[PDB]
Write a protein that binds this DNA or RNA. Structure first.
Length: 83
DNA sequence: CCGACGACAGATAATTTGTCACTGTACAGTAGAATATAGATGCGCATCTATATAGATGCAAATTGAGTGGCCTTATTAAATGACTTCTCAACCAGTCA
């Protein structure tokens, strides 16, 4: 590793899944769209309100294990940060 | 015989997700509203115009009444009618007769 790369070959290497959520792609897109749509024009929707919409979709899909509030805050984290 | 690399299997923290406990912060009457501007539209009042004159005047026929100018056989007699003029208009004495 020190032959094929610099001192960064003898530091640790971070995992490939760092910054990817383990929840299903449907849920990550649902949370992303729900937040963005909830803010069109004058509306101002908080992550907690998004989490309630997640729970409402979970009842429709009969999903016994939807993303919880902390997972919604993490999914929206970079979206709030860029801003 | 020694060193380096790949296959397969095994153990491991980073990553993501979930749960749990402590916490900063909004709820407290409140931004639709004030103050300029241009730009278009409409009602009112004045200021012209173009038409429409009837009354007055000048003139030129069209008679119309009122003028004026130019052209014409004559002399005797007789009768008739109507007129004019002139003249005249004494009175008793002297000589017969039945």
């Amino acid at each position: 590793n020190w032959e094929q790369d610099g001192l960064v070959g003898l530091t640790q290497t971070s995992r490939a899944d760092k910054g990817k959520h383990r929840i299903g792609e449907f849920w990550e897109n649902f949370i992303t769209k729900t937040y963005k749509e909830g803010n069109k024009g004058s509306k101002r929707m908080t992550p907690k309100q998004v989490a309630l919409r997640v729970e409402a979709k979970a009842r429709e899909l009969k999903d016994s294990k939807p993303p919880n509030y902390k997972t919604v805050l993490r999914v929206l984290a970079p979206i709030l940060e860029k801003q």
